[PDB]
Structure 1
Amino acid sequence: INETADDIVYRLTVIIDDRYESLKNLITLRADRLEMIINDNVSTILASI
């Protein structure tokens, strides 16, 4: 039944890994954009005075 155990762990590892990479990507996505937005607005505040 060890091969079954191996398959159980492997299949859920793939699942866990996939959702992990997706959450990493999303966190990175929103953070990059928040930085962009902030740096853009700072340029306007300083641009207009």
Structure 2
Amino acid sequence: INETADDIVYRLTVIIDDRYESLKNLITLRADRLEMIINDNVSTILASI
């Protein structure tokens, strides 16, 4: 139960990393998106005043 029942830590890390990397990537994507839906749009309201 020592050299075998360590999967509860390891197998969960495989899960928690996948959810973390999907969270980390999605936050980065959506935040970069809003930054490209701001600096792209503010340059248009500035290009007309």
TM-score by length of 1: 0.90
SS in 2 for 1:5: coil
Which ranges of 4 or more aligned residues in structure 1 deviate by more than 4 Å? Answer: none
Deviations 1:7-49 (A, max 9, x none): 1110011100110000000000000000011001111111012
Whether 2:48 is the aligned partner of 1:45: answer no
Higher percent of residues as helix:
1
Q: Which runs of 5+ in 2 are unaligned?
A: none
Give the aligned length.
49
Q: Which runs of 5+ in 1 are unaligned?
A: none
Structural RMSD (CA): 0.9
Q: Percent identity?
A: 100
